[PDB]
Amino acid sequence: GSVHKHTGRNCGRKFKIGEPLYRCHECGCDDTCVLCIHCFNPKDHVNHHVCTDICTEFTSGICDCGDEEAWNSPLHCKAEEQ
Numbered sequence: 001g002s003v004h005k006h007t008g009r010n011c012g013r014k015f016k017i018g019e020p021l022y023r024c025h026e027c028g029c030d031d032t033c034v035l036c037i038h039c040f041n042p043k044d045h046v047n048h049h050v051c052t053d054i055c056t057e058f059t060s061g062i063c064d065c066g067d068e069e070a071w072n073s074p075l076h077c078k079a080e081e082q
């Protein structure tokens, strides 16, 4: 796949229509904390309760990967893998 890292900052990517918004009960500060397809690392969340929402006109937002305020645990952004 293609990759564009956001090293040293937050992701903040606006979700595209049809795309999943990933949330994790264990890792997220709260239920508004979400991760995009570029960033969500399945390895961070193996035995966690992860849910996906789907981006629409009413359901939108920005990816919180790299926003320290959004996460209990250190995330390993999928984009950073090579």
Ligand SMILES: [Zn+2]
Pocket: 011, 012, 013, 035, 036, 037, 038, 039, 040, 063, 064, 065
């Ligand atoms: Zn992201």
Ligand SMILES: [Zn+2]
Pocket: 006, 011, 038, 039, 040, 065, 066, 077, 078, 079
């Ligand atoms: Zn990321």
Ligand SMILES: [Zn+2]
Pocket: 024, 025, 026, 027, 028, 044, 045, 048
């Ligand atoms: Zn998690």
